[PDB]
Copies of this chain bind each other. A is one copy, B any other.
Amino acid sequence: HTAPCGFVVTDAVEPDQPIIYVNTVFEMVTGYRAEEVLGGNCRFLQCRGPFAKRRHPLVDSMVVSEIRKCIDEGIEFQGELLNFRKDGSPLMNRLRLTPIYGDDDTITHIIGIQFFIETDIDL
């Protein structure tokens, strides 16, 4: 009895969607513990390991920019992009985002659902 996907919840009211919650599948597949990711953005998953300072070149710029647009416009998203576990191994992430609307027609949260998929790998 275990989830088929990663779940992530961000606070859409604070700036830049800080993570307030990740599920155990997120933790187990990416190798990052909740306690090291809370209060920050998920884009760290696009840098190869905890110490790369730049978005890795094999993650699709075009897809990343679609995420920005969708978040900006308060609409849902789905796409595939390269991520990396804490140990730097690559990881393919079939990601879906959906916003949660509060009373005032303002967004309180975004939900992230990650369907992880692995690869042939290099490096």
Contacts and interface: CB of A to CB of B under 8 A. Distances in A.
A20 to B, nearest CB: 7
A96 B74 CA distance: 14
10 smallest A-B Cβ distances: which pairs?
A98-B98, A3-B21, A111-B113, A1-B34, A76-B76, A96-B100, A7-B7, A4-B21, A4-B9, A78-B101
Copies in the complex: 2
A23 interface: yes
Interface residues of A, number: 24
Secondary structure at the A interface, as helix, strand, loop or mixed, is: strand
Given A3-B7, A3-B23, A98-B111, 12 more contacts: A1-B21, A1-B35, A2-B20, A2-B21, A5-B109, A7-B23, A23-B23, A76-B98, A96-B100, A98-B98, A100-B113, A109-B115
Interface of A: 1-5, 7, 9, 20-21, 23, 34-35, 38, 76, 78, 94, 96, 98, 100-101, 109, 111, 113, 115
